[PDB]
Design a protein around this ligand. Structure first.
Ligand SMILES: [Cl-]
Ligand SMILES: [Cl-]
Ligand code: NA
Length: 129
């Protein structure tokens, strides 16, 4: 599913991501835009053999099982394919664990390089939330 911008903002809010660990909703929308273009089906292989999955490109080396990432962990207790669903519940729940890991949203490379320090409120302007 390719979300609309305000459609994703509403879903993230409802799932309790707005201001989660101090990150305002626009941070999460901005992260999703550059990680996945708001496309839940996005997948991307990494050089180490792991794969990133879903709207927030969550990686199989620590967070989900995809059956082909040796020595990996599954800290969100889920198949990586669950992160590809039109329903973003699993992605949001797992992102809450990742962002609580110690580095906050610096865990998302695209957030650090394209969102951090910018006017991320712009990502939710116009939205009825
Ligand atoms: Cl914001
Ligand atoms: Cl933080
Ligand atoms: Na894994």
């Amino acid at each position: 599913k390719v979300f609309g911008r305000c459609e994703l903002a509403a879903a993230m809010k409802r799932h309790g991501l707005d201001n989660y660990r101090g990150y305002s909703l626009g941070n999460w929308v901005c992260a999703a835009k550059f990680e996945s273009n708001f496309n839940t089906q996005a997948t991307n292989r990494n050089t180490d053999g792991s794969t990133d999955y879903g709207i927030l490109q969550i990686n199989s080396r620590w967070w989900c099982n995809d059956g082909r990432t040796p020595g990996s962990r599954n800290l969100c207790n889920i198949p990586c394919s669950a992160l590809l669903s039109s329903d973003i519940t699993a992605s949001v729940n797992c992102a809450k664990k990742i962002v609580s890991d110690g580095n906050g949203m610096n865990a998302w490379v695209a957030w650090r390089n394209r969102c951090k320090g910018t006017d991320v409120q712009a990502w939710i302007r116009g939205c009825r939330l």
